[PDB]
């Protein structure tokens, strides 16, 4: 949106949100992040955010329900998966 | 030769580029041996 079609009104919100993500980590009490995201999502120029908002509300219902699975050893994805899953390189150091 | 040699040392390595080959190199033996007669850069026009 900097290469074509300036549109200050929402590019400014986009930068405001990027700085809020970049400078700071999010914790529970996410509702600020949700409201700021939707305040940014006045503009729809990709359908991918329509998936991501669904990826927000799933966490919201999951954020309330953490109390009833307080102890749950759940598997999380490693690094090499996330690269091969996302698309970007690995540089393994020594195999000592 | 040397103005190309330093450009050999930037965009390529120490081994000679393709272009250092093509520039000629005058053999340093082709003088005419003019000092069988001793003259100079004197203006010899006054003589004639």
């Amino acid at each position: 949106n900097m290469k074509l079609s300036p549109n200050a009104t929402a590019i400014m919100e986009g930068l405001n949100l990027l700085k809020y993500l970049l400078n700071n980590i999010v914790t529970p009490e996410k509702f600020q992040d949700f409201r700021n995201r939707f305040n940014r999502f006045f503009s729809h120029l990709e359908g991918h955010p329509l998936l991501k908002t669904m990826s927000m509300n799933i966490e919201k219902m999951t954020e309330i329900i953490t109390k009833e699975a307080s102890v749950k050893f759940e598997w999380f994805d490693g690094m090499l998966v996330k690269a091969v899953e996302k698309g970007h390189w690995l540089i393994l150091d020594n195999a000592n | 030769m040397k103005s190309w040699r330093n450009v050999r040392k930037v965009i390529s390595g120490d081994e000679e580029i393709f272009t250092e080959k093509l520039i000629n190199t005058i053999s340093d033996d082709d003088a005419p041996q003019s000092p069988r007669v001793y003259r100079t850069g004197m203006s010899i026009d006054s003589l004639f």
Partner: protein, 279 residues
């Protein structure tokens, strides 16, 4: 003490525009002497050659860059090339090479002006260029450039004599300037018999118009012979600044020997002179 760190240590190596001028400044660094040789547009692509003017303007407008003349000289070289219709030739020449880059890449707009050297010998892409003119792997590609500075190095020096004879005075009065007065419409009474300035002026016109409308780059080593003549001319003018008339007897000897030798090579470059070498 000049043992400095070059600019690549301090330049971002993920941009194109600076990293070439890095090589420029570094080539100026490593030479102990001033390269009056152009070997700098040897490195700049034919694309953003127009940045040279802003480069020299930046050199002057700021305080650094202890050298500031050579950035002007290379700019004079480029604007001497655009004075010829020469870069249209070489930009039209590489266009097959831009087609290989067009096809190797999934998306590539066939641009107007190619990001490639002004040399035609620094690279692997020659055999795409050398679908004709196997002279490219013979020295005439080099001497095309080098000879082209010499002419430009001569015109700038000769022309000041034409301004000097135009501004002629009995003090700072020299024999080459007496010959320039002979050509110049404002002529001084003393020694009119030296009409050589025109004779050492029309040769550059022959070369300039010839190179403008040759369009071959496939002759019989013609550019090698547009070089040795230029040495002879630089010798002729240097021995023309003071009294030596007999030394000019071996300068109509030499051009005719030059003519008879290139004619022995059957290089068809022969029409546009040879009443000037006989006058």
């Amino acid at each position: 003490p000049d043992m400095s760190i070059p600019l690549k240590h301090y330049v971002p190596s993920y941009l194109s525009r600076p990293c070439i001028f890095a090589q420029v400044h570094d080539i100026l660094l490593l030479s102990d002497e001033e390269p009056i040789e152009e070997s700098l547009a040897a490195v700049i692509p034919i694309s953003h050659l127009g940045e040279v003017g802003k480069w020299a303007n930046n050199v002057l407008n700021c305080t650094e860059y202890s050298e500031k003349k050579i950035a002007e000289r290379l700019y004079v070289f480029i604007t001497f090339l655009t004075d010829m219709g020469v870069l249209e030739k070489i930009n039209n020449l590489y266009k097959p090479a831009n087609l290989k880059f067009q096809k190797a890449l999934g998306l590539h707009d066939k641009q107007l002006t190619e990001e490639t050297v002004s040399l035609t010998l620094n690279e692997y892409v020659l055999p795409t260029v050398s679908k004709y003119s196997d002279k490219i792997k013979s020295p005439e590609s080099l001497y095309l450039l080098s000879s082209l500075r010499l002419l430009l190095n001569s015109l700038n020096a000769l022309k000041l004599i034409n301004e000097k004879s135009t501004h002629g005075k009995i003090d700072e009065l020299t024999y080459i300037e007496l010959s320039a007065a002979a050509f110049n419409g404002r002529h001084l009474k003393n020694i009119p018999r030296i009409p050589i300035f025109c004779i050492l002026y029309n040769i550059l016109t022959v070369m300039s118009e010839n190179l403008k409308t040759e369009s071959l780059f496939c002759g019989s080593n013609q550019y090698q012979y547009y070089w040795d003549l230029l040495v002879i001319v630089i010798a002729a003018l240097e021995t023309a600044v003071t009294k030596d008339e007999a030394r000019l007897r071996v300068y109509k000897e030499l051009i005719d020997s030059w003519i008879a030798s290139v004619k022995s090579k059957s290089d068809i470059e022969i029409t546009p002179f040879l009443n000037i070498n006989l006058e």
